[PDB]
Amino acid sequence: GLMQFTLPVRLCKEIELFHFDIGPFENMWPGIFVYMVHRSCGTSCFELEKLCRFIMSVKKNYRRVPYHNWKHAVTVAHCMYAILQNNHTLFTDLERKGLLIACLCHDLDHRGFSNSYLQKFDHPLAALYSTSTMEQHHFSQTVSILQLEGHNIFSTLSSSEYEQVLEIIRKAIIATDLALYFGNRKQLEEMYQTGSLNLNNQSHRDRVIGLMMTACDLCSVTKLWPVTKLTANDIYAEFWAEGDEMKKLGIQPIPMMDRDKKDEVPQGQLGFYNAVAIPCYTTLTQILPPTEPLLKACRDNLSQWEKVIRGEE
Ligand SMILES: CC1(C)C(=O)NC(=O)c2c1ccc1nc(Cc3ccccc3)[nH]c21
Numbered sequence: 001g002l003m004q005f006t007l008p009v010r011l012c013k014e015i016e017l018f019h020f021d022i023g024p025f026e027n028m029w030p031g032i033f034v035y036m037v038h039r040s041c042g043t044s045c046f047e048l049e050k051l052c053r054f055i056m057s058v059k060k061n062y063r064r065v066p067y068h069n070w071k072h073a074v075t076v077a078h079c080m081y082a083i084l085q086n087n088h089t090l091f092t093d094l095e096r097k098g099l100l101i102a103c104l105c106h107d108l109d110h111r112g113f114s115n116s117y118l119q120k121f122d123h124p125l126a127a128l129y130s131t132s133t134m135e136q137h138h139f140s141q142t143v144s145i146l147q148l149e150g151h152n153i154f155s156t157l158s159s160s161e162y163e164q165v166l167e168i169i170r171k172a173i174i175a176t177d178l179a180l181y182f183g184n185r186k187q188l189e190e191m192y193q194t195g196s197l198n199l200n201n202q203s204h205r206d207r208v209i210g211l212m213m214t215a216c217d218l219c220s221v222t223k224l225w226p227v228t229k230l231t232a233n234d235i236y237a238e239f240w241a242e243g244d245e246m247k248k249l250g251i252q253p254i255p256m257m258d259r260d261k262k263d264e265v266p267q268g269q270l271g272f273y274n275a276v277a278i279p280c281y282t283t284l285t286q287i288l289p290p291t292e293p294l295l296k297a298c299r300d301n302l303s304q305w306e307k308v309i310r311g312e313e
């Protein structure tokens with residue numbers, strides 16, 4: 001109980017900032033997550049032995065894919081940590097518990113393929129879950145690991161609190177389906193502008209937690225340019241492999257997934273920042289003003305992609 005995790009000074013300071021990169025030392029990532037839980041939630045939230053066993057089972061159930069991997073899980077949890085720490089009083093005790101775990105678990109057992117590809121391949125998971133296919137699978141995998149012996153980090157919650165926290169985690173994980181992002185943000189936009197947004201309305205909180213989940217999920221666009229640029233390569237490594245698998249099924253993939261159309265990537269990043277990223281952090285900044293640095297960093301990275309197109313790099 002008297003056993004804090006402490007980070008070296010540069011990490012202790014920079015981990016508080018939105019643009020923090022967790023670094024290339026895999027063995028430090030479990031400690032960074034526990035550090036973040038202890039400060040975000042409390043040193044009493046989780047039994048340390050159980051938490052540690054949970055983290056290591058989650059790590060084991062992330063695959064060695066270029067982007068949708070263990071490092072993404074921890075990266076997305078760090079962004080949630082930064083949002084929670086900058087919005088201290090807005091979130092319940094159960095919410096701070098649930099959301100850091102939801103983020104860590106949100107892409108469990110990802111294979112590096114979209115819901116679209118699962119459906120066109122006729123993958124078994126596409127027959128078990130007709131929409132938000134991989135996201136229903138990620139929640140399913142989270143519950144599985146929580147039910148491993150000595151892995152129930154929520155064991156001290158009442159029967160009804162346990163149900164609420166698993167309901168927080170399910171919605172948060174489903175919300176990382178980008179197909180659901182567009183309508184969720186439009187609805188949040190209308191509620192904020194017409195003045196009807198109400199954080200005591202559970203259905204409203206749900207929508208706001210969903211946008212936070214999209215914001216954390218896309219947070220590679222809020223890093224320093226060299227982090228953002230190299231992470232973009234990793235996601236395109238997945239996209240191009242999926243395009244290869246589409247061609248093997250006799251389907252010309254969309255240009256984004258076609259490795260013969262790499263030239264079109266800079267313009268695809270513009271569309272993505274304009275259609276997805278900027279609107280996401282804009283609405284988030286309206287609802288939670290302290291998250292403005294994510295919008296500022298995203299805008300700086302858009303400008304960097306515009307410079308790539310203009311041959312200024
Ligand atoms: C943040 C990061 C890694 C990025 O830097 N650059 C991307 O392009 C990207 C990212 C994450 C998830 C992405 N999903 C898509 C596909 C998509 C395109 C248009 C509309 C919806 C969905 N692109 C993604």
Ligand SMILES: [Mg+2]
Nearest residue numbers: 106107176177
């Ligand atoms: Mg996902």
Ligand SMILES: [Zn+2]
Nearest residue numbers: 072106107217
């Ligand atoms: Zn993700």
